[PDB]
Structure 1
């Protein structure tokens, strides 16, 4: 899948989900919510983008050993929400997402990609809302898209 090899715009973030049930709910309802600090980071990136390129999210459940898919941010963060929707009751907030890949990709396939903005650590050792440089994100996206 040579599609992503020539991407010229966009920002890309890691999402770490404590719960696979929350991944299921995100796919069913096309929504996500991060922590307070994570929501602020994603909101800033989405808003400054002003629709000039995509914001992609690379999802992985904590401790699972694999990534589980890719979604595009499709709205700014709405902070005026009901509590208790997600795996920890305190998280409020919501933004729309569109899932573009739902597939398990082992960390072994992605570990060789290092993030020069994060001490050259493997992309598989990232924390929630770690940003991925575009040239490294393109390599992750090609691998996820091509994996079978």
Structure 2
């Protein structure tokens, strides 16, 4: 069902995460970690302290899809062999994340969702780190195919 999912998403904040390659999202799905540029690191840390759940929704550039979404379980902390586009010293710290859905979603399926915080452009459109408004972000997550391998019981207890 979708009920535990909706509970996790209740009053969450949402951020669009753009990756230049699939290898970095694969690493993040395997290791439960993410790292971003300091400008986005600061925004995510602020949001982590501010809300019950901070959701990162991942899209690989030029893939035409989202690759899933995850919940921040920590602030950033200061090695991961990211495929950098840019040096490793340029990155901020590492966030721990818990995946909520590792399934992909094609942009064609979110064409009816616009993001008020990016001029009501379709939610697929945005820079890395763009915040997605609550209602748009919730509906986007509900569009993903259910990931029956994930048990949100252990995510709920971290809220």
What is the distance in 2 between the residues matched to 1:127 and 1:27?
21
Matched, 1:37 2:39: yes
Secondary structure, aligned partner of 1:142: helix
Q: Structure 1, unaligned stretches of length 5 or more?
A: none
What is the CA distance between 1:111 and its match in structure 2? 2.1
Structure 2 counterpart of 1:86: 82
1:1-148 paired onto structure 2 within 5 Å: 2-3=2-3, 7-49=9-51, 53-78=52-77, 80=78, 85-88=81-84, 89-90=87-88, 91-145=91-145
Deviation of 1:145 after TM superposition, in Å, equals: 3.8
TM-score, normalising length from structure 2? 0.80
Most deviating of 3-12 and 61-70:
3-12
Structure 1 window deviating more from structure 2 (91-100 vs 64-73): it is 91-100
Report the aligned-residue RMSD: 2.0
- Work out the number of aligned pairs and report it: 141
TM-score by structure 1 length?
0.86
Structure 1 pair 77–64 and aligned structure 2 pair: CA distance change class (3 A)? same
Unaligned runs of 5+ in 2: 148-159
CA distance in 1 between partners of 2:141 and 2:61 (Å)? 20
Displacement of 1:17 in angstroms is: 0.7
Contact 2:12 2:54 in 1 (8 A): yes
- 1:2-37 per-position Cα deviation (integer Å, ceiling 9, x unaligned): 535675311111100112111111111110001111
Secondary structure of the 2:104 match is strand
* In 2, Cα distance between equivalents of 1:44 and 1:92: 14
